[PDB]
Design a protein around this ligand. Structure first.
Ligand SMILES: Cn1cc(-c2cc(-c3cc(Cl)c(F)c(OCc4ccccc4Cl)c3)c(=O)n(-c3cccnc3)c2)c(=O)[nH]c1=O
Ligand SMILES: Cn1cc(-c2cc(-c3cc(Cl)c(F)c(OCc4ccccc4Cl)c3)c(=O)n(-c3cccnc3)c2)c(=O)[nH]c1=O
Lengths: 301, 301
């Protein structure tokens, strides 16, 4: 028993992390097969970041200007191209540690593991969720650019995130592995706001199911509600509206615990309108929304 | 910026995890050099767990009764011995993935990463702290026995924990890699209580420094206190007493932020006596005590 914010084992990804140096800038890249992926702003100088012309900047670089180092092994760059906000460096050697992998674009509300890296060397691993506003609340310092987020299914690594920037607000934004940003953001040092964020309702409900499974049940009450009635309360407290697709996804946890989804919604409604009154749930004094229904079943299975 | 509960990259340990089967019982073992370490209760049956005679039980087993499988590779067992509550299986092959490593016994209040495993296959990684009462609040299901906790310093893996049991209360207890339990616990299914637990004061203070570093400063006030005065409040709220050794360990964070340790104690005192009044600190509505001063500097560096 017990419930923790749990990351995937990072070994398969550690073997793909390399250091990419261009000019004076150094950050992390991802070496899969004979391609190295990294943020395209590796080609920028300090004065370039305000409105860089990445086409013009990339034109001034040659293969030999991109220094790729895998641990202590230097890689020979035989080609370079730009795809959206990602730079793709063709090297003459396939990564012998290349796991089975796919590139995927996750949806808001879904979770993944982040392997924080610096100078191509792994530093730590943690789980986080793609916020509804396409930001993530991570832990990133200068030099962390190029770190990636991922999920693992048995032996297949699904890469979903590459880190690019921290906004003035302290939140973190990035791209999928085809270089398309999550959210409205652009890789320029100019004003850009993240949308209003909201709480991931289906994840909060899944987390309440995980609490019940692990012995925390003081929040279960004698009430029930309707999808429409609960959504009235959701809107008031800036929660994502609950849909039937959400109810369906919660079906397994509902069956495992014998608590109807709408009954659990009545508990959440009561918590939103009255607080926890100094109590805690799974060691937290607030409602957690960074566990997906799949995460709960994984951990609780 | 940002602050997260961050685990070490688990790759170096994933390559050491194996499956150990004895009779009908299967759990995880740690393969380092030509030795496999696992909990000695792998030799028990259901009826044995109430008062097993491990010497008598081990006498009925032979080398060929211990099935060690590293992924798909079967290992040939050439020797077996018992050290405290740990079983040591000598195999005829050295683990080619053996990292640099040491065995260490951590102190209460210190943290480490747990690689949760099942059937010798890594499942997830998370950070937790050795509670003052020598328990840990983890996430462990049946079959997780033999999972290990560790820290990593550059390239050296310090193993500090092997998982053995979940108590009726839901907390988790285990041994160091020499088979000595943390705490008063014994590997028998008999009544055994964990001592009164307390909050790790020095970790709470380090966490408040991490908050200030990352922009959360609403809890800083115009007061100060003394070591003796604060300890009066610590005792009231079941906090570990603060010592000068603790103040010394907080010296770096004090210097980095310019906040005297005793000034920060005055903030903690105010939080203990008045609560957070609905506010939050680093995304938490309670005082976090599972970050060590070293963890804060690591992440914030
Ligand atoms: C040379 N150099 C630079 C970086 C590096 C670059 C960036 C970075 C990259 C680009 Cl294109 C930007 F438009 C940018 O302005 C963000 C911004 C500022 C002000 C107003 C609005 C906005 Cl949007 C920032 C970064 O944000 N970080 C970072 C730091 C801390 C946590 N996370 C990310 C790091 C690096 O890692 N390695 C390396 O060598
Ligand atoms: C056959 N078998 C058994 C286990 C296995 C054994 C145990 C386990 C081992 C020993 Cl020696 C015990 F005295 C024991 O009684 C704990 C207890 C019960 C009642 C009152 C007081 C006490 Cl103290 C339990 C276990 O606790 N867990 C576990 C489960 C969930 C989370 N964490 C740990 C698992 C295994 O993993 N694999 C495998 O094959």
């Amino acid at each position: 028993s017990g419930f923790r914010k749990m990351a995937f084992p990072s070994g398969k990804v550690e073997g793909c992390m390399v250091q990419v140096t261009c000019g004076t800038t150094t950050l992390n890249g991802l070496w899969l097969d004979d391609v190295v992926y990294c943020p395209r702003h590796v080609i920028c100088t300090s004065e370039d970041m305000f409105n860089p012309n990445y086409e013009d900047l990339l034109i001034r670089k040659s293969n030999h200007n991109f220094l790729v180092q895998a641990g202590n092994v230097q890689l020979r760059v035989i080609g370079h191209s730009m795809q959206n906000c990602v730079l793709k460096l063709k090297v003459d050697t396939a990564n012998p540690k290349t796991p089975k992998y796919k590139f995927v674009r996750i949806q808001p509300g879904q979770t993944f593991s982040v392997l924080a890296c610096y100078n191509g060397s792994p530093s730590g691993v943690y789980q986080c969720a793609m916020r509804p506003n396409f930001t993530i609340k991570g832990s990133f310092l200068n030099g962390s650019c190029g770190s990636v987020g991922f999920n693992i299914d048995y032996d297949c690594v699904s890469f979903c995130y590459m880190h690019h920037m921290e906004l003035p607000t302290g939140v973190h934004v990035g791209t999928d592995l085809e270089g398309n940003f999550y959210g409205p953001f652009v890789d320029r040092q100019t004003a850009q706001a993240a949308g209003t964020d909201t709480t991931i309702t289906v994840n909060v409900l899944a987390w309440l199911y995980a609490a019940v499974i692990n012995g925390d049940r003081w929040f279960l009450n004698r009430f029930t509600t309707t999808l429409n009635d609960f959504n009235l309360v959701a809107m008031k407290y800036n929660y994502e509206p609950l849909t039937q697709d959400h109810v369906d996804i919660l079906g397994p946890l509902s069956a495992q615990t014998g608590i109807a989804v709408l009954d659990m919604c009545a508990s959440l409604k009561e918590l939103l309108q009255n607080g926890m009154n100094g109590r805690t749930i799974l060691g937290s004094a607030l409602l957690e929304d960074e566990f997906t229904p799949f995460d709960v079943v994984r951990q609780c299975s």
